[PDB]
C-alpha cells in the first residue's frame, strides 16, 4: 500500500552548558534507518537499519553534510526565536522539525511535509498544496515573509516531489523484506479479577507491523471509548508493535463485551469474545 519517509529533528538549548544539542532521525514508515547526534563522537550520519548499510561513501558524505548544515541552521533559529519573543537566555528552549513525503501503492508522490515547532507548539508549516505557509503567531509571520521572499516553498516542493520520492522508492526496494511486509496482530484476551464485584477484560494485539491499529471494546454492540483504558502503541524492540485495550466488567457480565481489531494485515476486522 502507501509508504512514508520522515525525518524528525530536535534541537535543545542548554544555557551555561555550551551549544544546543541536535538529534535527527530518519524513518521509512515505522522503521528507523538513520540518526545524527551533534553530541556523538562520529559527527556522521549513522546507519540504524541493515538495508541502509549498502549505501556507499558518497551517500554518507552527502547526508552528513546536509544534516550538519541543518544542525547549524537550527542553532541559529533558536537564537532568532529568543530575540523574536524576548525570552530570557537563562531558559532552555526546544526547536523541532519534521519533513518528508508519502507515496501511493504505485510509488507516485502523494503528499509532502516541511514543518517546525517551537517549545512544543506549531511555529510554521508548509501547507498541503506545497505553495504556501501557515504561521502560528506574529513571530512566525516574520519568518513566513522571509521564506516567501526567498522562495523556500518552491525549493522544498522540488525536494519533496523529487529527491524525497526517489530516496523513499530506493529504500523500499533495497529493504523490501523488512519494509514491504505486513505482520498481522496476534490477538488474545486476559481476565483479571479486581474484586468479587468487578474484573478487568484486556484485549491484546501483539507482533504487528506497521504500527497503525484500531483496538476498541463494545458492550452490547455499543461504543465504550470513554470507559476503555487504551495504552499507547508500543514497540516490542524486534520491529513489531504491541497494544492493549481494557474494560472493567461487572461480575458475570463478561459476555456482553466484544473486542474489535482493525489492521492492514487483517483481510477482515476481527471480533473477539471472552
Amino acid at each position: 500500500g502507501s509508504h512514508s519517509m520522515r525525518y524528525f529533528s530536535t534541537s535543545v538549548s542548554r544555557p551555561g552548558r555550551g551549544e544546543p544539542r541536535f538529534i535527527a532521525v530518519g524513518y521509512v514508515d515505522d522503521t528507523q534507518f538513520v540518526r545524527f547526534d551533534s553530541d556523538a563522537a562520529s559527527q556522521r550520519m549513522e546507519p540504524r537499519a541493515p538495508w541502509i548499510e549498502q549505501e556507499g561513501p558518497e551517500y554518507w558524505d552527502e547526508e552528513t553534510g546536509k544534516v550538519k548544515a541543518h544542525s547549524q541552521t537550527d542553532r541559529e533559529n533558536l537564537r532568532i526565536a529568543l530575540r523574536y519573543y524576548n525570552q530570557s537566555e537563562a531558559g532552555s528552549h526546544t526547536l523541532q522539525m519534521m519533513f518528508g513525503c508519502d507515496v501511493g501503492s504505485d510509488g507516485r508522490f502523494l503528499r509532502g511535509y516541511h514543518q517546525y515547532a517551537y517549545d512544543g507548539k506549531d511555529y510554521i508549516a508548509l501547507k498541503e498544496d506545497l505553495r504556501s505557509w501557515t504561521a502560528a503567531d506574529m513571530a512566525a509571520q516574520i519568518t513566513k515573509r522571509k521564506w516567501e521572499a526567498a522562495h523556500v516553498a518552491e525549493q522544498q516542493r522540488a525536494y519533496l516531489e523529487g529527491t524525497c520520492v526517489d530516496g523513499l522508492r530506493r529504500y523500499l526496494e533495497n529493504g523490501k523484506e523488512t519494509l514491504q511486509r505486513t505482520d498481522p496482530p496476534k490477538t488474545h484476551m486476559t481476565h483479571h479479577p479486581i474484586s468479587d464485584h468487578e474484573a478487568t477484560l484486556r484485549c491484546w494485539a501483539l507482533g504487528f507491523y506497521p504500527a497503525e491499529i484500531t483496538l476498541t471494546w463494545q458492550r452490547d454492540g455499543e461504543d465504550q471509548t470513554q470507559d476503555t483504558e487504551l495504552v499507547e502503541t508500543r514497540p516490542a524492540g524486534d520491529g513489531t508493535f504491541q497494544k492493549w485495550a481494557a474494560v472493567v466488567v461487572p461480575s458475570g457480565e463478561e459476555q456482553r463485551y466484544t473486542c474489535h481489531v482493525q489492521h492492514e494485515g487483517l483481510p477482515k476486522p476481527l471480533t473477539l469474545r471472552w
Binding site: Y7, A69, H70, H114, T143, W147
Partner: peptide
C-alpha cells in the same frame, strides 16, 4: 535522503 541546503533562517 535529507533535505538539501541551505536553510533560510527564521
Amino acid at each position: 535522503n535529507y533535505t538539501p541546503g541551505p536553510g533560510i533562517r527564521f
